[PDB]
Amino acid sequence: GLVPRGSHMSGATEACLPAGQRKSGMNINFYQYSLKDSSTYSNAAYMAYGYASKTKLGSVGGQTDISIDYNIPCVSSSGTFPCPQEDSYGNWGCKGMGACSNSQGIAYWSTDLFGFYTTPTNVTLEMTGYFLPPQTGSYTFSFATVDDSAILSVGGSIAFECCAQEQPPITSTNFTINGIKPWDGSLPDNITGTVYMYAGYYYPLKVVYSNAVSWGTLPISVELPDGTTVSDNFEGYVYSFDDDLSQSNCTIPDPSIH
Ligand SMILES: [Cl-]
Ligand SMILES: [Cl-]
Ligand SMILES: [Gd]
Ligand SMILES: [Gd]
Ligand SMILES: [Gd]
Ligand SMILES: [Gd]
Ligand SMILES: [Gd]
Ligand SMILES: [Gd]
Ligand SMILES: [Gd]
Ligand SMILES: [Gd]
Ligand SMILES: [Gd]
Ligand SMILES: [Gd]
Ligand SMILES: [Gd]
């Protein structure tokens, strides 16, 4: 065969070749989410697009460092310091700080999430951008843990539409990683999803993340085809492009034959 046959029954993930000015990093949009609401974020429709029906709080662009690790304050005898969740104890104190005088169950304001001043105790955020694979092959994305609820989607018409990064969210619930908080209360660590990607094509990437109370955590990694792992800092891998809905050739439905 002069040419490759193509992935079977058009199984290839859709990718993009945006012709505009590339910008390092992902865009982060922040949306309202109610303190102690442990039900809203348990719905697939909400995590895919419904989040954007709530008040938009703000945004920051150009973010390459994308893992979430938010610790609430312990108001202690020696001042106010963030408590690592594993160091919290009793009712309650923080190891090396003694007893904390403040409630675990109120809203707290902080710039910890990408420098945006908001309430990381209770918020939903949407990260959008394009993932640029340097190598052709299988990529395994993972969340080490999820506190409270999250999804990761990769691909044109799954994350968002090519050359349309800034548009309202699409409705696809075909998540690459489903880390939605179960109604039943369950859910395990190191949750994963794999995508076969072709080098030099730009793959739409969406992460939606929500927290209702206190600590928030979402450590994001990808394992490359060469078996190495990139964690937290995706510099060199993730990019944004301004919308160009007029770029006719932007969508590549099958990179395996393009
Ligand atoms: Cl603090
Ligand atoms: Cl202590
Ligand atoms: Gd980080
Ligand atoms: Gd950092
Ligand atoms: Gd942090
Ligand atoms: Gd931070
Ligand atoms: Gd920090
Ligand atoms: Gd940080
Ligand atoms: Gd589409
Ligand atoms: Gd939480
Ligand atoms: Gd491996
Ligand atoms: Gd860090
Ligand atoms: Gd724009």
Swiss-Prot record:
PTM: Extensively O-glycosylated.
Role description: Cell wall protein that participates directly in adhesive cell-cell interactions during yeast flocculation, a reversible, asexual and Ca(2+)-dependent process in which cells adhere to form aggregates (flocs) consisting of thousands of cells. The lectin-like protein sticks out of the cell wall of flocculent cells and selectively binds mannose residues in the cell walls of adjacent cells. Activity is inhibited by mannose, but not by glucose, maltose, sucrose or galactose.
Domain of life from the UniProt record: Eukaryota
Biological source species: Saccharomyces cerevisiae (strain ATCC 204508 / S288c) (Baker's yeast)
Chain residue ranges for the region called Sugar recognition: 184-227
Protein family per UniProt: Belongs to the flocculin family.
Subcellular location(s) per record: Secreted, Cell wall; Membrane
Name of the protein in question: Flocculation protein FLO5
Glycosylation sites: 122, 174, 190, 249
Domain notes: The number of the intragenic tandem repeats varies between different S.cerevisiae strains. There is a linear correlation between protein size and the extend of adhesion: the more repeats, the stronger the adhesion properties and the greater the fraction of flocculating cells.
Record note on biotechnological use: For many industrial applications in which the yeast S.cerevisiae is used, e.g. beer, wine and alcohol production, appropriate flocculation behavior is one of the most important characteristics of a good production strain. The ability of yeast cells to flocculate is of considerable importance, as it provides an effective, environment-friendly, simple and cost-free way to separate yeast cells from the fermentation product at the end of fermentation.
Gene name for this UniProt entry: FLO5
Domain PA14 span(s) in chain numbering: 61-236
